[PDB]
Ligand binder design. Structure first.
Ligand SMILES: CS[C@H]1O[C@H]([C@H](NC(=O)[C@H]2NC[C@@H]3C[C@H](CC(C)C)CCO[C@H]32)[C@H](C)Cl)[C@H](O)[C@H](O)[C@H]1O
Ligand SMILES: [K+]
Ligand SMILES: [Mg+2]
Ligand SMILES: [Mg+2]
Ligand SMILES: [Mg+2]
Ligand SMILES: [Mg+2]
Ligand SMILES: [Mg+2]
Ligand SMILES: [Mg+2]
Ligand SMILES: [Mg+2]
Ligand SMILES: [Mg+2]
Ligand SMILES: [Mg+2]
Ligand SMILES: [Mg+2]
Ligand SMILES: [Mg+2]
Ligand SMILES: [Mg+2]
Ligand SMILES: [Mg+2]
Ligand SMILES: [Mg+2]
Ligand SMILES: [Mg+2]
Ligand SMILES: [Mg+2]
Ligand SMILES: [Mg+2]
Ligand SMILES: [Mg+2]
Ligand SMILES: [Mg+2]
Ligand SMILES: [Mg+2]
Ligand SMILES: [Mg+2]
Ligand SMILES: [Mg+2]
Ligand SMILES: [Mg+2]
Ligand SMILES: [Mg+2]
Ligand SMILES: [Mg+2]
Ligand SMILES: [Mg+2]
Ligand SMILES: [Mg+2]
Ligand SMILES: [Mg+2]
Ligand SMILES: [Mg+2]
Ligand SMILES: [Mg+2]
Ligand SMILES: [Mg+2]
Ligand SMILES: [Mg+2]
Ligand SMILES: [Mg+2]
Ligand SMILES: [Mg+2]
Ligand SMILES: [Mg+2]
Ligand SMILES: [Mg+2]
Ligand SMILES: [Mg+2]
Ligand SMILES: [Mg+2]
Ligand SMILES: [Mg+2]
Ligand SMILES: [Mg+2]
Ligand SMILES: [Mg+2]
Ligand SMILES: [Mg+2]
Ligand SMILES: [Mg+2]
Ligand SMILES: [Mg+2]
Ligand SMILES: [Mg+2]
Ligand SMILES: [Mg+2]
Ligand SMILES: [Mg+2]
Ligand SMILES: [Mg+2]
Ligand SMILES: [Mg+2]
Ligand SMILES: [Mg+2]
Ligand SMILES: [Mg+2]
Ligand SMILES: [Mg+2]
Ligand SMILES: [Mg+2]
Ligand SMILES: [Mg+2]
Ligand SMILES: [Mg+2]
Ligand SMILES: [Mg+2]
Ligand SMILES: [Mg+2]
Ligand SMILES: [Mg+2]
Ligand SMILES: [Mg+2]
Ligand SMILES: [Mg+2]
Ligand SMILES: [Mg+2]
Ligand SMILES: [Mg+2]
Ligand SMILES: [Mg+2]
Ligand SMILES: [Mg+2]
Ligand SMILES: [Mg+2]
Ligand SMILES: [Mg+2]
Ligand SMILES: [Mg+2]
Ligand SMILES: [Mg+2]
Ligand SMILES: [Mg+2]
Ligand SMILES: [Mg+2]
Ligand SMILES: [Mg+2]
Ligand SMILES: [Mg+2]
Ligand SMILES: [Mg+2]
Ligand SMILES: [Mg+2]
Ligand SMILES: [Mg+2]
Ligand SMILES: [Mg+2]
Ligand SMILES: [Mg+2]
Ligand SMILES: [Mg+2]
Ligand SMILES: [Mg+2]
Ligand SMILES: [Mg+2]
Ligand SMILES: [Mg+2]
Ligand SMILES: [Mg+2]
Ligand SMILES: [Mg+2]
Ligand SMILES: [Mg+2]
Ligand SMILES: [Mg+2]
Ligand SMILES: [Mg+2]
Ligand SMILES: [Mg+2]
Ligand SMILES: [Mg+2]
Ligand SMILES: [Mg+2]
Ligand SMILES: [Mg+2]
Ligand SMILES: [Mg+2]
Ligand SMILES: [Mg+2]
Ligand SMILES: [Mg+2]
Ligand SMILES: [Mg+2]
Ligand SMILES: [Mg+2]
Ligand SMILES: [Mg+2]
Ligand SMILES: [Mg+2]
Ligand SMILES: [Mg+2]
Ligand SMILES: [Mg+2]
Ligand SMILES: [Mg+2]
Ligand SMILES: [Mg+2]
Ligand SMILES: [Mg+2]
Ligand SMILES: [Mg+2]
Ligand SMILES: [Mg+2]
Ligand SMILES: [Mg+2]
Ligand SMILES: [Mg+2]
Ligand SMILES: [Mg+2]
Ligand SMILES: [Mg+2]
Ligand SMILES: [Mg+2]
Ligand SMILES: [Mg+2]
Ligand SMILES: [Mg+2]
Ligand SMILES: [Mg+2]
Ligand SMILES: [Mg+2]
Ligand SMILES: [Mg+2]
Ligand SMILES: [Mg+2]
Ligand SMILES: [Mg+2]
Ligand SMILES: [Mg+2]
Ligand SMILES: [Mg+2]
Ligand SMILES: [Mg+2]
Ligand SMILES: [Mg+2]
Ligand SMILES: [Mg+2]
Ligand SMILES: [Mg+2]
Ligand SMILES: [Mg+2]
Ligand SMILES: [Mg+2]
Ligand SMILES: [Mg+2]
Ligand SMILES: [Mg+2]
Ligand SMILES: [Mg+2]
Ligand SMILES: [Mg+2]
Ligand SMILES: [Mg+2]
Ligand SMILES: [Mg+2]
Ligand SMILES: [Mg+2]
Ligand SMILES: [Mg+2]
Ligand SMILES: [Mg+2]
Ligand SMILES: [Mg+2]
Ligand SMILES: [Mg+2]
Ligand SMILES: [Mg+2]
Ligand SMILES: [Mg+2]
Ligand SMILES: [Mg+2]
Ligand SMILES: [Mg+2]
Ligand SMILES: [Mg+2]
Ligand SMILES: [Mg+2]
Ligand SMILES: [Mg+2]
Ligand SMILES: [Mg+2]
Ligand SMILES: [Mg+2]
Ligand SMILES: [Mg+2]
Ligand SMILES: [Mg+2]
Ligand SMILES: [Mg+2]
Ligand SMILES: [Mg+2]
Ligand SMILES: [Mg+2]
Ligand SMILES: [Mg+2]
Ligand SMILES: [Mg+2]
Ligand SMILES: [Mg+2]
Ligand SMILES: [Mg+2]
Ligand SMILES: [Mg+2]
Ligand SMILES: [Mg+2]
Ligand SMILES: [Mg+2]
Ligand SMILES: [Mg+2]
Ligand SMILES: [Mg+2]
Ligand SMILES: [Mg+2]
Ligand SMILES: [Mg+2]
Ligand SMILES: [Mg+2]
Ligand SMILES: [Mg+2]
Ligand SMILES: [Mg+2]
Ligand SMILES: [Mg+2]
Ligand SMILES: [Mg+2]
Ligand SMILES: [Mg+2]
Ligand SMILES: [Mg+2]
Ligand SMILES: [Mg+2]
Ligand SMILES: [Mg+2]
Ligand SMILES: [Mg+2]
Ligand SMILES: [Mg+2]
Ligand SMILES: [Mg+2]
Ligand SMILES: [Mg+2]
Ligand SMILES: [Mg+2]
Ligand SMILES: [Mg+2]
Ligand SMILES: [Mg+2]
Ligand SMILES: [Mg+2]
Ligand SMILES: [Mg+2]
Ligand SMILES: [Mg+2]
Ligand SMILES: [Mg+2]
Ligand SMILES: [Mg+2]
Ligand SMILES: [Mg+2]
Ligand SMILES: [Mg+2]
Ligand SMILES: [Mg+2]
Ligand SMILES: [Mg+2]
Ligand SMILES: [Mg+2]
Ligand SMILES: [Mg+2]
Ligand SMILES: [Mg+2]
Ligand SMILES: [Mg+2]
Ligand SMILES: [Mg+2]
Ligand SMILES: [Mg+2]
Ligand SMILES: [Mg+2]
Ligand SMILES: [Mg+2]
Ligand SMILES: [Mg+2]
Ligand SMILES: [Mg+2]
Ligand SMILES: [Mg+2]
Ligand SMILES: [Mg+2]
Ligand SMILES: [Mg+2]
Ligand SMILES: [Mg+2]
Ligand SMILES: [Mg+2]
Ligand SMILES: [Mg+2]
Ligand SMILES: [Mg+2]
Ligand SMILES: [Mg+2]
Ligand SMILES: [Mg+2]
Ligand SMILES: [Mg+2]
Ligand SMILES: [Mg+2]
Ligand SMILES: [Mg+2]
Ligand SMILES: [Mg+2]
Ligand SMILES: [Mg+2]
Ligand SMILES: [Mg+2]
Ligand SMILES: [Mg+2]
Ligand SMILES: [Mg+2]
Ligand SMILES: [Mg+2]
Ligand SMILES: [Mg+2]
Ligand SMILES: [Mg+2]
Ligand SMILES: [Mg+2]
Ligand SMILES: [Mg+2]
Ligand SMILES: [Mg+2]
Ligand SMILES: [Mg+2]
Ligand SMILES: [Mg+2]
Ligand SMILES: [Mg+2]
Ligand SMILES: [Mg+2]
Ligand SMILES: [Mg+2]
Ligand SMILES: [Mg+2]
Ligand SMILES: [Mg+2]
Ligand SMILES: [Mg+2]
Ligand SMILES: [Mg+2]
Ligand SMILES: [Mg+2]
Ligand SMILES: [Mg+2]
Ligand SMILES: [Mg+2]
Ligand SMILES: [Mg+2]
Ligand SMILES: [Mg+2]
Ligand SMILES: [Mg+2]
Ligand SMILES: [Mg+2]
Ligand SMILES: [Mg+2]
Ligand SMILES: [Mg+2]
Ligand SMILES: [Mg+2]
Ligand SMILES: [Mg+2]
Ligand SMILES: [Mg+2]
Ligand SMILES: [Mg+2]
Ligand SMILES: [Mg+2]
Ligand SMILES: [Mg+2]
Ligand SMILES: [Mg+2]
Ligand SMILES: [Mg+2]
Ligand SMILES: [Mg+2]
Ligand SMILES: [Mg+2]
Ligand SMILES: [Mg+2]
Ligand SMILES: [Mg+2]
Ligand SMILES: [Mg+2]
Ligand SMILES: [Mg+2]
Ligand SMILES: [Mg+2]
Ligand SMILES: [Mg+2]
Ligand SMILES: [Mg+2]
Ligand SMILES: [Mg+2]
Lengths: 48, 275
RNA sequence: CCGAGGGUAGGGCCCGUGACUGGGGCGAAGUCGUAACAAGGUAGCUGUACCGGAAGGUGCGGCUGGAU
RNA sequence: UGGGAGAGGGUGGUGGAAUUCCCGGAGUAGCGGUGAAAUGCGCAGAUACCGGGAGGAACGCCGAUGGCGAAGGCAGCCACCUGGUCCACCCGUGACGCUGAGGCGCGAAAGCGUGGGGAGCAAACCGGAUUAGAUACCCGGGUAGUCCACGCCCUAAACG
RNA sequence: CGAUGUCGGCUCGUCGCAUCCUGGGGCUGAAGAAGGUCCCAAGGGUUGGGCUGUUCGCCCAUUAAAGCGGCACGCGAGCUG
RNA sequence: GAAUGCCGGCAUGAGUAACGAUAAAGAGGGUGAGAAUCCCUCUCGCCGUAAGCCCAAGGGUUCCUACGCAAUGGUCGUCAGCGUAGGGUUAGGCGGGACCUAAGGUGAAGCCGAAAGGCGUAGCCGAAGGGCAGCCGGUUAAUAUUCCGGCCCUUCCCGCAGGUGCGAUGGGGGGACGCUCUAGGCUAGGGGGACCGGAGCCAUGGACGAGCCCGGCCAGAAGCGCAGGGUGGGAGGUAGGCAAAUCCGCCUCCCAACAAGCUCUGCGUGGUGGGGAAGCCCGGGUGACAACCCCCCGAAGCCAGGGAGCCAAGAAAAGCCUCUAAGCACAACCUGCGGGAACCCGUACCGCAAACCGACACAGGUGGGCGGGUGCAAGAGCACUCAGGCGCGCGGGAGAACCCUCGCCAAGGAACUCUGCAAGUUGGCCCCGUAACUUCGGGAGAAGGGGUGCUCCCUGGGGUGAUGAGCCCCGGGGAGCCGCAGUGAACAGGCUCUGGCGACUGUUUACCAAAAACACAGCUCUCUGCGAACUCGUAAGAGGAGGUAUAGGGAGCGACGCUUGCCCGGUGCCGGAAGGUCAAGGGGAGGGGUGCAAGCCCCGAACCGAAGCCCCGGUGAACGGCGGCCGUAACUAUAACGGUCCUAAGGUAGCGAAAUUCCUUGUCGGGUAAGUUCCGACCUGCACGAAAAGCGUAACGACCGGAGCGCUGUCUCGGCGAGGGACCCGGUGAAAUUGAACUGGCCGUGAAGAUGCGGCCUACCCGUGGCAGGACGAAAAGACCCCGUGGAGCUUUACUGCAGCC
RNA sequence: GAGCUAGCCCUGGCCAGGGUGAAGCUGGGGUGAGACCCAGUGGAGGCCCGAACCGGUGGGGGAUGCAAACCCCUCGGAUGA
């Protein structure tokens, strides 16, 4: 049937992207945490 | 003169439609129509704050002139009577000798080609506006400002009217459409006549679809829900209220008065509505 | 080909009959009250409406075929 | 052709008396009701009285043993629209009349539908009396209805 | 109770005998015929249908007869539900 | 050594199940170490409103080519969406950006919040909506409206010429809009041609023919032609469009007004440029100087912003035009012409799928366009087929049980069973015909029947053309012919009678319930006078509503019909300036501590003092509730009647063994041979009853009862047949489970149901196909039940708080 | 976290073909004028049959599946909430 992942580049970037994270206290903590953990990606890559 | 249908579908048994016989112009005045922003009952939080709204036909808002003391002493001609989907009354298109065009809500009896005017000197004819003090006692009136220069507030729905009953100093006494007697300031404007399209109350919507067209989504009885939803929720089988009948939010809904006690307008309400 | 009639399907009228049910007539000495005939003890009758174990009562309007 | 009387019908307007309710004043120990009472109402200020407001319904005297209409029925006053009818003159048509199965229309009250209205009155209903009982008569309440608009119903001691 | 699936049916049987029928008997208030009662006997047989989920039971039409009970109220790693 | 322990390794089950749609394969020839599996040819089959083609998302090199086969590929592999390498995506016009706005988002002003932050007019952002200039062909192994060729067009800059009061973010116009139905004329697409072009073909009995087979177009600027859209012109007045205005609006007059004129599109034609089949020969070459014409059908697309009708009344902003304001009028703008300038990103490939979402090359899921022909009434339905694309990445045999999917069946025909579950029957169209009841629509496709092919003959109207022929779509009449059978194949209702519930179409527990549940028009109660009530929010602010009592919130009831009775003592809610109680506060009789004292300090009675509560009333479509015992009639029985106790009042109409009746399969009647169900009645209603509505009701229902007809493999009662499996051989090769095992029957025993103990009986060793009685078989630390001073949801007149309100 | 699902907001798109035949309109009849009747025209509808599309009624299959909800037959809606 219709499953739960229906990918959408605009949706992805606008929901989880760098600018959406920076705009918000909780989003900026996410970036601070993933930097401290040393994540190679701070943000889900989407093509655009 | 509401129109019936023959029972050629189950719903057409009872459906009645307005006669529209008074309407003379069937597309609005482009210089007067804005987009009406449908809300669905949602506020600026995105939250539903008025349940069961949404999904009705698209509409354009017709800008209505509720001041009229705007244009004292400037006569206007009644060019068209038009359908307005944002209100129960019909509306009348006015061509002012100014060249300015305006919509008022159409009183009963108003005719295309007649003239109306507004101000302290206006004749007491249907469709004229005057401050309340200059309208003789006993006159049936509509589109009444509640406070001076603040805009017509009372008696605007199809068929309704207020009746001037007497004066007392700076104030006129009106029997509102609800039967309340209230002091209204005399400098408040009002329009001579009763609102038109009084057959409006006798329309039978006929089927569930019709309420959807008006943006009315289905109502759910509290008795149909569960306890997490509503005071009337739950119970094995059907169930009476089993407590004083309540709203979804717990307050009592049979009798419990709700007008604020220390409201300043109480000094101006003479007698509460009846019936 | 038509054709007595036999078959299939569906209608119409009539008769008889039916658990049970509705009132009706009748029947020497049953029970309840007393509505009408006298102003019958609330004048009566009336069309209708509502009510009441029952006759009845009452509302509205009508009639005199009502008294003093 | 010229006149007449009339609550004949329809629409709109409008006037005074009275009742109820509301407000203000004054005032106090009862009022109301009946055969007699009681329920009821009243010191939370009733009743009786004055002034003010609102609303509905009915139209005192004139009024009659009267008038009008086909019957049902029709009554404050005003205006409009409209019907029948009588009298005078003896002018016009020249039997064009009578009745009338069917048909059609009208049709008191009650009742019904949909809006409205709702003061007084009052089926139902409640209460107080009475009574053996009292699902009555009498008393205190009281909802339809009584009123308006439109549409039904089509009955009658619709009787002379 | 770190699970022994539970009514009825269907399918498949197998066993006990306190025997429904058929076989052998004694007694009879057994004339015959037909029965009653008890004894021996488990080899075989022991119907189709209406009602109800029913087991059971009642009823219809038969029958030599339309037996009763055990097998985890036999049988859901066989079915039904 | 145990923790259903943790991590890892390796066993068992087992050479077992499986190898992923039953659309299907066979042979010849190549290549190679190796071939059912790669390449080529012929034959066969499958899709063909797709299983073909084009877009969009998503994916991200998977594209093309050479070289490869360890792993990936459910087998094989020389092949591949796999490994290595190289190559490949070209734009002023296509799409997005340097344009516009929508929801929404963001946010100078401003508002609010302990902080973080929340709001918010303008403005900005934001598109698959608006706006805006490219068509046809050729070329590559791989890109093309991008390269090339042909013919067209857009904007920016500069210049020349002619013209004009030029000039905008400001004013105005326009842009600019629904649903159904739909006219005229066209195009797309298609059918036919005895006409035009073509390599050929004559078979096997016939045909050298008006024979067969193939094809007969595409694009095009100006001009022109047909068909449409849009649009009044002039004058005078003017206070309105937040400055101005010659524009727009409003008034007057004159003229043109089914017109015309102007303008803008579509289609046709059009200089010119291209394409061009079968067949044959090696993607190419020929065909070929290819021909390119006539007739008919014909859109849902085009003209278009067309027309009509209806009510539920149908975006915005820019581009564009007009008006003017500063300004400038040596400028500027408008038209025409010329030259120059014209950027950034995407473009490969897959895209109903093996490349996207489902862990897989997964029978599932994924939006838009095209979607040919014939016949079947129509159609996107169905059957077969075109173009094109496939045979689904294990095969070979065999022809057991059993399973799945399918075909048939004697006689019977529901006897099956909880139930006709399932499967039959019926089945399209045309015609005849059709009941109770009804809200007059319906019920209705009621039921039930007759016709249906082919040939010849006669003929009616509609379309095209011409009014004829021809083509075309509907027909009608007569006579015949054949078969068991003519919607001859495929697609295509079984029907009736009678109950219950719900009026109805709708909605629902994604993934065990589709229903009688929810909703629903409609009815009632109640709140709300507008800065409404109510809702979300600490607030600001929103929604309500740019609405205003014919409106909005809440609640119950649920079309419609006929109706909805009695109780206000209790709870609720509404009314009540008295009275009682009542907190902080006021008040301060009267005390107390301390100090030499002035004083400082503390307690403090009366009395004044809100809401709430008490108390007095009202209120049921508010929460709710609507009796008992005993007696009585001239047969009996039974009580219309009475007595008495109780209550706030004692259930009215209507209905009743019911979706409700315990006793119960109540009793009687109906239907049946037989009826615990059904239907109709009765009424001692365990325990109906009137908006948690009562009693009905035409129509409706994948709801749940009962009956009958039709027909059947449901059954008596099974039989045979088909294919996919099971079985055998070759290839690849799992699983849960598993203390170890050398693992028999009885009768006993044992923690009470023993392969494992005792006694006896039976039994040579090992497998293969089968069946399910046992291993208290597997799975799941029982969900029932209890226990834990475990947990969570829910309630209230449990306790105690809090928001909110007073 | 609303790329699943639920509701709403903005903007687009889709629904073969056939059947039934409301109002109105025209004409005729009828009448004092009317209501009204008849024919034609017309094309309404949470109207009917049925694809696409959206569903998921009954049964069968599947049950270490093709699939952590699928497949086959059947069945509901299909201009509308
Ligand atoms: C569905 S089969 C599925 O569950 C089974 C389980 N059985 C039981 O629990 C039984 N134990 C006794 C209990 C008694 C009651 C008495 C009765 C009066 C309530 C009968 C019901 O259960 C029985 C479920 C509950 Cl029937 C087995 O675990 C089976 O192994 C598994 O496969
Ligand atoms: K239980
Ligand atoms: Mg889904
Ligand atoms: Mg999606
Ligand atoms: Mg995207
Ligand atoms: Mg996107
Ligand atoms: Mg998105
Ligand atoms: Mg966001
Ligand atoms: Mg972002
Ligand atoms: Mg922060
Ligand atoms: Mg920070
Ligand atoms: Mg890095
Ligand atoms: Mg992140
Ligand atoms: Mg109607
Ligand atoms: Mg009707
Ligand atoms: Mg109107
Ligand atoms: Mg605008
Ligand atoms: Mg709004
Ligand atoms: Mg907002
Ligand atoms: Mg709300
Ligand atoms: Mg809402
Ligand atoms: Mg409104
Ligand atoms: Mg209107
Ligand atoms: Mg005021
Ligand atoms: Mg109404
Ligand atoms: Mg609407
Ligand atoms: Mg509603
Ligand atoms: Mg509801
Ligand atoms: Mg509930
Ligand atoms: Mg519930
Ligand atoms: Mg919740
Ligand atoms: Mg709660
Ligand atoms: Mg609650
Ligand atoms: Mg409850
Ligand atoms: Mg409930
Ligand atoms: Mg209950
Ligand atoms: Mg419930
Ligand atoms: Mg209760
Ligand atoms: Mg409550
Ligand atoms: Mg409140
Ligand atoms: Mg009021
Ligand atoms: Mg014969
Ligand atoms: Mg006696
Ligand atoms: Mg009497
Ligand atoms: Mg008497
Ligand atoms: Mg008398
Ligand atoms: Mg008497
Ligand atoms: Mg009485
Ligand atoms: Mg006093
Ligand atoms: Mg009044
Ligand atoms: Mg004479
Ligand atoms: Mg009458
Ligand atoms: Mg009357
Ligand atoms: Mg007495
Ligand atoms: Mg247990
Ligand atoms: Mg275990
Ligand atoms: Mg277990
Ligand atoms: Mg059986
Ligand atoms: Mg013997
Ligand atoms: Mg034996
Ligand atoms: Mg048992
Ligand atoms: Mg029994
Ligand atoms: Mg015998
Ligand atoms: Mg037994
Ligand atoms: Mg037992
Ligand atoms: Mg037992
Ligand atoms: Mg068992
Ligand atoms: Mg089982
Ligand atoms: Mg069982
Ligand atoms: Mg088992
Ligand atoms: Mg077992
Ligand atoms: Mg140990
Ligand atoms: Mg552990
Ligand atoms: Mg271990
Ligand atoms: Mg482990
Ligand atoms: Mg290791
Ligand atoms: Mg391991
Ligand atoms: Mg291993
Ligand atoms: Mg091994
Ligand atoms: Mg094995
Ligand atoms: Mg397997
Ligand atoms: Mg498999
Ligand atoms: Mg298949
Ligand atoms: Mg198959
Ligand atoms: Mg095969
Ligand atoms: Mg071959
Ligand atoms: Mg081969
Ligand atoms: Mg090979
Ligand atoms: Mg090989
Ligand atoms: Mg193969
Ligand atoms: Mg090949
Ligand atoms: Mg085709
Ligand atoms: Mg991928
Ligand atoms: Mg390999
Ligand atoms: Mg290999
Ligand atoms: Mg290698
Ligand atoms: Mg591999
Ligand atoms: Mg595989
Ligand atoms: Mg090789
Ligand atoms: Mg490439
Ligand atoms: Mg270019
Ligand atoms: Mg630039
Ligand atoms: Mg932009
Ligand atoms: Mg944005
Ligand atoms: Mg933008
Ligand atoms: Mg765009
Ligand atoms: Mg473009
Ligand atoms: Mg071009
Ligand atoms: Mg090359
Ligand atoms: Mg020049
Ligand atoms: Mg517009
Ligand atoms: Mg508009
Ligand atoms: Mg638009
Ligand atoms: Mg519409
Ligand atoms: Mg063309
Ligand atoms: Mg064709
Ligand atoms: Mg003009
Ligand atoms: Mg001016
Ligand atoms: Mg165009
Ligand atoms: Mg050549
Ligand atoms: Mg279309
Ligand atoms: Mg168009
Ligand atoms: Mg805007
Ligand atoms: Mg200047
Ligand atoms: Mg100059
Ligand atoms: Mg110019
Ligand atoms: Mg740039
Ligand atoms: Mg490309
Ligand atoms: Mg597909
Ligand atoms: Mg597609
Ligand atoms: Mg592929
Ligand atoms: Mg997933
Ligand atoms: Mg595959
Ligand atoms: Mg797939
Ligand atoms: Mg073709
Ligand atoms: Mg067909
Ligand atoms: Mg295959
Ligand atoms: Mg396939
Ligand atoms: Mg074999
Ligand atoms: Mg066959
Ligand atoms: Mg047979
Ligand atoms: Mg039969
Ligand atoms: Mg038969
Ligand atoms: Mg049966
Ligand atoms: Mg049945
Ligand atoms: Mg069943
Ligand atoms: Mg069949
Ligand atoms: Mg068929
Ligand atoms: Mg009939
Ligand atoms: Mg019948
Ligand atoms: Mg019938
Ligand atoms: Mg009926
Ligand atoms: Mg009828
Ligand atoms: Mg028919
Ligand atoms: Mg038929
Ligand atoms: Mg024939
Ligand atoms: Mg033939
Ligand atoms: Mg059918
Ligand atoms: Mg229903
Ligand atoms: Mg339901
Ligand atoms: Mg019902
Ligand atoms: Mg009903
Ligand atoms: Mg309903
Ligand atoms: Mg429907
Ligand atoms: Mg569930
Ligand atoms: Mg479910
Ligand atoms: Mg689930
Ligand atoms: Mg299911
Ligand atoms: Mg359910
Ligand atoms: Mg259903
Ligand atoms: Mg539900
Ligand atoms: Mg409901
Ligand atoms: Mg309903
Ligand atoms: Mg109702
Ligand atoms: Mg109401
Ligand atoms: Mg709140
Ligand atoms: Mg705070
Ligand atoms: Mg607003
Ligand atoms: Mg009826
Ligand atoms: Mg009470
Ligand atoms: Mg009370
Ligand atoms: Mg009370
Ligand atoms: Mg107080
Ligand atoms: Mg109670
Ligand atoms: Mg009580
Ligand atoms: Mg009772
Ligand atoms: Mg009563
Ligand atoms: Mg009654
Ligand atoms: Mg009974
Ligand atoms: Mg019943
Ligand atoms: Mg009961
Ligand atoms: Mg019973
Ligand atoms: Mg029972
Ligand atoms: Mg019985
Ligand atoms: Mg019987
Ligand atoms: Mg009884
Ligand atoms: Mg209730
Ligand atoms: Mg109930
Ligand atoms: Mg009730
Ligand atoms: Mg019914
Ligand atoms: Mg019915
Ligand atoms: Mg239904
Ligand atoms: Mg259903
Ligand atoms: Mg049957
Ligand atoms: Mg069979
Ligand atoms: Mg076979
Ligand atoms: Mg072998
Ligand atoms: Mg092998
Ligand atoms: Mg392998
Ligand atoms: Mg061992
Ligand atoms: Mg061992
Ligand atoms: Mg062994
Ligand atoms: Mg052994
Ligand atoms: Mg034991
Ligand atoms: Mg043992
Ligand atoms: Mg042993
Ligand atoms: Mg042992
Ligand atoms: Mg041993
Ligand atoms: Mg031992
Ligand atoms: Mg031993
Ligand atoms: Mg031993
Ligand atoms: Mg083997
Ligand atoms: Mg084996
Ligand atoms: Mg076993
Ligand atoms: Mg077993
Ligand atoms: Mg097995
Ligand atoms: Mg076992
Ligand atoms: Mg065990
Ligand atoms: Mg076991
Ligand atoms: Mg389990
Ligand atoms: Mg555990
Ligand atoms: Mg446990
Ligand atoms: Mg458990
Ligand atoms: Mg559970
Ligand atoms: Mg226990
Ligand atoms: Mg405790
Ligand atoms: Mg304890
Ligand atoms: Mg606890
Ligand atoms: Mg808790
Ligand atoms: Mg707190
Ligand atoms: Mg969504
Ligand atoms: Mg459709
Ligand atoms: Mg169509
Ligand atoms: Mg038809
Ligand atoms: Mg017609
Ligand atoms: Mg028309
Ligand atoms: Mg429909
Ligand atoms: Mg049909
Ligand atoms: Mg299914
Ligand atoms: Mg079936
Ligand atoms: Mg499953
Ligand atoms: Mg399926
Ligand atoms: Mg199917
Ligand atoms: Mg179907
Ligand atoms: Mg349908
Ligand atoms: Mg359709």
């Amino acid at each position: 049937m219709k499953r739960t992942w229906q990918p959408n580049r605009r949706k992805r970037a606008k929901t989880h992207g760098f600018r959406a994270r920076m705009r918000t206290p909780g989003g900026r903590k996410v970036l601070k945490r993933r930097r401290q953990k040393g994540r190679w990606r701070l943000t889900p890559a989407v093509r655009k | 003169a509401v129109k019936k249908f023959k029972p050629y579908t189950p719903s057409r048994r009872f459906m009645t439609v307005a006669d529209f016989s008074e309407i003379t112009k069937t597309e609005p005045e482009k210089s007067l129509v804005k987009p009406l922003k449908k809300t669905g009952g949602r506020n600026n939080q995105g939250r539903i704050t008025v349940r069961f709204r949404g999904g009705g036909h698209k509409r354009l808002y017709r800008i209505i002139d509720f001041k009229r003391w705007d244009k004292v002493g400037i006569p206007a001609k009644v060019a068209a009577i038009e359908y307005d989907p944002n209100r129960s009354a019909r509306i009348a298109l006015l061509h002012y000798v100014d060249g300015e065009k305006r919509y008022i809500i159409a009183p009963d009896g108003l005719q295309v080609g007649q003239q109306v005017v507004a101000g302290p000197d206006a004749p007491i004819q249907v469709g004229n506006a005057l401050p309340l003090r200059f309208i003789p006692v006993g006159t049936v009136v509509h589109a009444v400002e509640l406070e001076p220069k603040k805009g017509a507030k009372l008696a605007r729905a199809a068929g309704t009217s207020a009746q001037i009953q007497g004066r007392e100093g700076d104030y006129v006494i009106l029997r509102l459409p609800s039967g309340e007697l209230r002091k209204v300031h005399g400098e408040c404007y009002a329009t001579v006549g009763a609102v038109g399209n009084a057959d409006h109350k006798n329309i039978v919507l006929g089927k569930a679809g019709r309420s959807r067209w008006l943006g009315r989504r289905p109502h759910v009885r509290g008795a149909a829900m569960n306890p997490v939803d509503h005071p009337h929720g739950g119970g094995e089988g059907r169930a009476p209220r089993g407590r004083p009948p309540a709203s979804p939010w717990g307050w009592q809904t049979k009798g419990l008065k709700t007008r604020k006690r220390r409201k300043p307008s109480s000094r101006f309400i003479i007698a509460r509505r009846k019936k």
